Amino acid sequence: VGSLNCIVAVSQNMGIGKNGDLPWPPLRNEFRYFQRMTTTSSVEGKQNLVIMGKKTWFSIPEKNRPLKGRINLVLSRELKEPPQGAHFLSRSLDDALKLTEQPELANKVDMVWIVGGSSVYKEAMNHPGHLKLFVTRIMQDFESDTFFPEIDLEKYKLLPEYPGVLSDVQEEKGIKYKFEVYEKND
Numbered sequence: 001v002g003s004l005n006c007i008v009a010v011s012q013n014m015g016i017g018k019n020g021d022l023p024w025p026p027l028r029n030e031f032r033y034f035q036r037m038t039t040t041s042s043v044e045g046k047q048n049l050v051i052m053g054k055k056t057w058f059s060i061p062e063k064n065r066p067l068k069g070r071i072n073l074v075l076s077r078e079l080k081e082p083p084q085g086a087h088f089l090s091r092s093l094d095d096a097l098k099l100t101e102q103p104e105l106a107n108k109v110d111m112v113w114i115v116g117g118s119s120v121y122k123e124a125m126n127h128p129g130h131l132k133l134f135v136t137r138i139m140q141d142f143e144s145d146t147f148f149p150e151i152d153l154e155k156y157k158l159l160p161e162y163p164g165v166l167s168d169v170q171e172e173k174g175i176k177y178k179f180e181v182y183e184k185n186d
Protein backbone atom coordinates (compact mmCIF):
# COMPACT_ATOMS: atom_id res chain seq x y z
CA VAL A 1 0.00 0.00 0.00
CA GLY A 2 0.94 3.65 -0.47
CA SER A 3 0.67 6.77 1.63
CA LEU A 4 -1.79 7.59 4.41
CA ASN A 5 -3.94 10.67 3.80
CA CYS A 6 -6.83 12.58 5.30
CA ILE A 7 -9.21 14.62 3.19
CA VAL A 8 -11.74 17.06 4.64
CA ALA A 9 -13.61 20.27 3.87
CA VAL A 10 -13.80 22.68 6.80
CA SER A 11 -15.68 25.89 7.34
CA GLN A 12 -14.05 29.02 8.73
CA ASN A 13 -15.29 28.02 12.21
CA MET A 14 -13.82 24.52 11.73
CA GLY A 15 -17.17 22.84 11.12
CA ILE A 16 -17.40 19.67 9.05
CA GLY A 17 -20.96 18.48 9.70
CA LYS A 18 -24.48 19.44 10.74
CA ASN A 19 -27.36 17.03 11.45
CA GLY A 20 -25.62 14.14 9.70
CA ASP A 21 -24.88 16.11 6.51
CA LEU A 22 -22.56 18.86 5.38
CA PRO A 23 -23.07 22.34 6.92
CA TRP A 24 -23.03 24.20 3.57
CA PRO A 25 -25.10 23.90 0.38
CA PRO A 26 -23.87 21.32 -2.16
CA LEU A 27 -20.68 22.45 -3.93
CA ARG A 28 -20.51 20.43 -7.15
CA ASN A 29 -16.85 21.03 -7.94
CA GLU A 30 -15.78 20.47 -4.34
CA PHE A 31 -17.44 17.04 -4.41
CA ARG A 32 -15.73 16.41 -7.77
CA TYR A 33 -12.40 17.21 -6.11
CA PHE A 34 -13.10 14.79 -3.27
CA GLN A 35 -14.05 12.14 -5.84
CA ARG A 36 -10.99 12.72 -8.01
CA MET A 37 -8.47 12.84 -5.17
CA THR A 38 -9.80 9.76 -3.37
CA THR A 39 -10.26 7.71 -6.56
CA THR A 40 -7.05 8.47 -8.47
CA SER A 41 -4.41 5.83 -7.83
CA SER A 42 -0.78 6.55 -8.62
CA VAL A 43 -0.05 2.83 -9.22
CA GLU A 44 -1.51 0.77 -12.05
CA GLY A 45 -3.66 -2.22 -11.14
CA LYS A 46 -4.60 -0.78 -7.74
CA GLN A 47 -7.47 1.17 -6.22
CA ASN A 48 -7.44 3.44 -3.21
CA LEU A 49 -9.16 2.55 0.05
CA VAL A 50 -11.39 4.99 1.92
CA ILE A 51 -11.81 4.56 5.69
CA MET A 52 -14.73 6.26 7.41
CA GLY A 53 -16.77 6.22 10.59
CA LYS A 54 -20.34 4.96 10.62
CA LYS A 55 -22.06 8.35 10.60
CA THR A 56 -19.91 9.46 7.66
CA TRP A 57 -20.95 6.33 5.74
CA PHE A 58 -24.60 7.22 6.26
CA SER A 59 -23.92 10.83 5.27
CA ILE A 60 -23.24 9.56 1.74
CA PRO A 61 -26.53 9.25 -0.20
CA GLU A 62 -27.45 5.58 -0.67
CA LYS A 63 -27.38 6.04 -4.44
CA ASN A 64 -23.63 6.82 -4.16
CA ARG A 65 -22.69 3.92 -1.82
CA PRO A 66 -20.24 2.33 -1.93
CA LEU A 67 -18.13 5.20 -3.32
CA LYS A 68 -17.42 3.91 -6.81
CA GLY A 69 -13.89 3.05 -7.87
CA ARG A 70 -12.67 2.84 -4.26
CA ILE A 71 -12.58 0.15 -1.60
CA ASN A 72 -14.96 1.32 1.15
CA LEU A 73 -14.17 0.45 4.77
CA VAL A 74 -16.46 1.44 7.65
CA LEU A 75 -15.39 1.71 11.29
CA SER A 76 -17.92 0.67 13.93
CA ARG A 77 -17.57 -0.86 17.39
CA GLU A 78 -21.27 -1.70 17.74
CA LEU A 79 -22.54 -2.83 14.33
CA LYS A 80 -23.25 -6.56 14.30
CA GLU A 81 -22.69 -6.75 10.53
CA PRO A 82 -21.09 -4.55 7.86
CA PRO A 83 -23.49 -1.92 6.51
CA GLN A 84 -25.02 -3.00 3.21
CA GLY A 85 -22.66 -1.89 0.45
CA ALA A 86 -19.49 -1.62 2.52
CA HIS A 87 -16.53 -3.70 1.41
CA PHE A 88 -14.97 -4.00 4.89
CA LEU A 89 -15.95 -3.38 8.50
CA SER A 90 -13.27 -2.86 11.16
CA ARG A 91 -13.55 -2.46 14.93
CA SER A 92 -10.68 0.02 15.20
CA LEU A 93 -8.46 2.17 13.02
CA ASP A 94 -5.47 -0.05 13.84
CA ASP A 95 -7.47 -3.07 12.66
CA ALA A 96 -8.34 -1.22 9.44
CA LEU A 97 -4.73 -0.28 8.70
CA LYS A 98 -3.46 -3.79 9.47
CA LEU A 99 -6.02 -5.02 6.94
CA THR A 100 -4.19 -2.99 4.29
CA GLU A 101 -0.93 -4.81 5.11
CA GLN A 102 -2.41 -8.21 4.20
CA PRO A 103 -0.52 -9.32 1.06
CA GLU A 104 -3.58 -9.90 -1.14
CA LEU A 105 -4.98 -6.49 -0.14
CA ALA A 106 -1.66 -4.63 -0.29
CA ASN A 107 -1.18 -5.65 -3.91
CA LYS A 108 -4.62 -4.15 -4.72
CA VAL A 109 -4.59 -1.00 -2.52
CA ASP A 110 -2.50 2.10 -3.20
CA MET A 111 -3.42 5.17 -1.16
CA VAL A 112 -5.39 5.00 2.06
CA TRP A 113 -7.75 7.95 2.53
CA ILE A 114 -9.28 8.84 5.91
CA VAL A 115 -12.54 10.57 5.05
CA GLY A 116 -13.87 11.24 8.57
CA GLY A 117 -15.47 11.89 10.86
CA SER A 118 -14.06 13.81 13.80
CA SER A 119 -12.73 10.95 15.91
CA VAL A 120 -11.19 9.15 12.92
CA TYR A 121 -9.38 12.29 11.74
CA LYS A 122 -8.08 12.99 15.24
CA GLU A 123 -6.67 9.49 15.70
CA ALA A 124 -5.07 9.46 12.25
CA MET A 125 -3.53 12.91 12.69
CA ASN A 126 -1.72 11.92 15.90
CA HIS A 127 -0.40 8.67 14.43
CA PRO A 128 3.38 9.13 13.98
CA GLY A 129 4.90 8.99 10.52
CA HIS A 130 4.18 10.37 7.08
CA LEU A 131 0.69 11.80 6.66
CA LYS A 132 -0.88 14.33 4.31
CA LEU A 133 -3.99 16.40 5.02
CA PHE A 134 -6.00 17.48 1.98
CA VAL A 135 -7.99 20.37 3.45
CA THR A 136 -10.60 22.45 1.63
CA ARG A 137 -10.90 25.81 3.37
CA ILE A 138 -14.54 26.86 2.97
CA MET A 139 -14.18 30.61 3.51
CA GLN A 140 -17.42 31.21 5.43
CA ASP A 141 -18.83 30.35 8.86
CA PHE A 142 -21.52 27.66 8.89
CA GLU A 143 -23.63 26.34 11.76
CA SER A 144 -22.06 22.99 12.65
CA ASP A 145 -22.28 20.25 15.29
CA THR A 146 -19.18 18.32 14.20
CA PHE A 147 -15.74 19.88 13.99
CA PHE A 148 -12.16 19.39 12.83
CA PRO A 149 -9.26 20.20 15.20
CA GLU A 150 -7.07 23.19 14.39
CA ILE A 151 -3.91 22.06 12.62
CA ASP A 152 -0.59 22.17 14.50
CA LEU A 153 1.70 24.06 12.10
CA GLU A 154 4.80 23.03 14.06
CA LYS A 155 3.97 19.47 12.88
CA TYR A 156 2.14 20.02 9.59
CA LYS A 157 3.72 22.02 6.76
CA LEU A 158 1.42 23.82 4.34
CA LEU A 159 2.72 22.81 0.92
CA PRO A 160 3.14 25.71 -1.56
CA GLU A 161 1.69 23.57 -4.38
CA TYR A 162 0.72 19.97 -5.04
CA PRO A 163 0.40 18.03 -8.32
CA GLY A 164 -3.18 18.00 -9.57
CA VAL A 165 -4.45 20.56 -7.02
CA LEU A 166 -5.62 23.99 -8.19
CA SER A 167 -4.25 26.70 -5.93
CA ASP A 168 -6.51 29.58 -7.01
CA VAL A 169 -9.51 30.55 -4.91
CA GLN A 170 -12.64 28.75 -6.15
CA GLU A 171 -16.22 29.91 -5.84
CA GLU A 172 -19.56 28.13 -6.14
CA LYS A 173 -22.96 29.47 -5.06
CA GLY A 174 -21.27 32.60 -3.74
CA ILE A 175 -19.08 30.50 -1.40
CA LYS A 176 -15.33 30.94 -1.81
CA TYR A 177 -13.04 28.05 -1.01
CA LYS A 178 -9.48 26.95 -1.61
CA PHE A 179 -7.64 23.64 -1.69
CA GLU A 180 -4.70 23.10 0.67
CA VAL A 181 -2.30 20.20 1.25
CA TYR A 182 -0.41 19.76 4.52
CA GLU A 183 2.33 17.25 5.26
CA LYS A 184 3.91 15.93 8.44
CA ASN A 185 6.89 13.59 8.83
CA ASP A 186 7.38 12.90 12.52
Ligand SMILES: NC(=O)c1ccc[n+]([C@@H]2O[C@H](COP(=O)([O-])OP(=O)(O)OC[C@H]3O[C@@H](n4cnc5c(N)ncnc54)[C@H](OP(=O)(O)O)[C@@H]3O)[C@@H](O)[C@H]2O)c1
Nearest residue numbers: 008009017020021053054055056075076077078116117118
Ligand atom coordinates in the same frame (compact mmCIF):
# COMPACT_ATOMS: atom_id res chain seq x y z
N1 LIG B 1 -16.84 18.17 5.65
C1 LIG B 1 -16.19 16.98 5.61
O1 LIG B 1 -15.12 16.86 5.03
C2 LIG B 1 -16.77 15.81 6.32
C3 LIG B 1 -16.11 14.57 6.36
C4 LIG B 1 -16.69 13.52 7.04
C5 LIG B 1 -17.89 13.70 7.71
N2 LIG B 1 -18.50 14.89 7.65
C6 LIG B 1 -19.75 15.12 8.38
O2 LIG B 1 -19.47 14.79 9.73
C7 LIG B 1 -20.57 14.07 10.29
C8 LIG B 1 -20.15 12.63 10.59
O3 LIG B 1 -18.96 12.62 11.37
P1 LIG B 1 -18.99 12.26 12.93
O4 LIG B 1 -17.70 12.72 13.56
O5 LIG B 1 -20.30 12.78 13.47
O6 LIG B 1 -19.13 10.65 12.95
P2 LIG B 1 -18.17 9.49 12.36
O7 LIG B 1 -16.79 9.50 12.95
O8 LIG B 1 -18.26 9.34 10.85
O9 LIG B 1 -19.00 8.27 12.97
C9 LIG B 1 -18.83 8.00 14.36
C10 LIG B 1 -19.15 6.53 14.59
O10 LIG B 1 -18.22 5.79 13.81
C11 LIG B 1 -17.71 4.69 14.58
N3 LIG B 1 -16.28 4.98 14.84
C12 LIG B 1 -15.67 6.18 14.78
N4 LIG B 1 -14.34 6.06 15.03
C13 LIG B 1 -14.10 4.76 15.24
C14 LIG B 1 -12.90 3.94 15.54
N5 LIG B 1 -11.70 4.53 15.68
N6 LIG B 1 -13.09 2.61 15.68
C15 LIG B 1 -14.30 2.03 15.53
N7 LIG B 1 -15.42 2.71 15.25
C16 LIG B 1 -15.37 4.05 15.10
C17 LIG B 1 -18.56 4.60 15.82
O11 LIG B 1 -19.69 3.83 15.42
P3 LIG B 1 -20.50 2.84 16.41
O12 LIG B 1 -21.32 3.80 17.25
O13 LIG B 1 -21.32 1.95 15.51
O14 LIG B 1 -19.42 2.13 17.19
C18 LIG B 1 -18.97 6.04 16.02
O15 LIG B 1 -20.20 6.13 16.75
C19 LIG B 1 -21.68 14.12 9.27
O16 LIG B 1 -22.35 15.38 9.50
C20 LIG B 1 -20.92 14.24 7.98
O17 LIG B 1 -21.69 14.85 6.95
C21 LIG B 1 -17.96 15.92 7.00
Ligand SMILES: Nc1nc(N)c2nc(CN(CO)c3ccc(C(=O)N[C@@H](CCC(=O)O)C(=O)O)cc3)cnc2n1
Nearest residue numbers: 007008009022031034035059060064067068115116136
Ligand atom coordinates in the same frame (compact mmCIF):
# COMPACT_ATOMS: atom_id res chain seq x y z
N1 LIG C 1 -12.98 17.73 0.52
C1 LIG C 1 -13.99 17.01 1.07
N2 LIG C 1 -15.24 17.47 0.83
C2 LIG C 1 -16.26 16.83 1.34
N3 LIG C 1 -17.52 17.24 1.13
C3 LIG C 1 -16.03 15.65 2.13
N4 LIG C 1 -17.07 14.96 2.65
C4 LIG C 1 -16.81 13.89 3.36
C5 LIG C 1 -17.98 13.09 3.92
N5 LIG C 1 -19.24 13.30 3.19
C6 LIG C 1 -20.30 14.03 3.77
O1 LIG C 1 -19.96 14.54 5.06
C7 LIG C 1 -19.44 12.84 1.84
C8 LIG C 1 -20.74 12.73 1.37
C9 LIG C 1 -20.99 12.32 0.07
C10 LIG C 1 -19.94 12.02 -0.77
C11 LIG C 1 -20.30 11.54 -2.17
O2 LIG C 1 -21.48 11.30 -2.44
N6 LIG C 1 -19.30 11.41 -3.00
C12 LIG C 1 -19.44 10.92 -4.37
C13 LIG C 1 -20.10 11.96 -5.31
C14 LIG C 1 -19.21 12.84 -6.18
C15 LIG C 1 -20.12 13.71 -7.11
O3 LIG C 1 -20.94 14.47 -6.53
O4 LIG C 1 -19.96 13.53 -8.34
C16 LIG C 1 -18.03 10.34 -4.79
O5 LIG C 1 -17.04 10.73 -4.08
O6 LIG C 1 -18.03 9.54 -5.73
C17 LIG C 1 -18.64 12.11 -0.30
C18 LIG C 1 -18.39 12.54 0.99
C19 LIG C 1 -15.46 13.48 3.54
N7 LIG C 1 -14.45 14.15 3.06
C20 LIG C 1 -14.71 15.26 2.31
N8 LIG C 1 -13.68 15.96 1.80
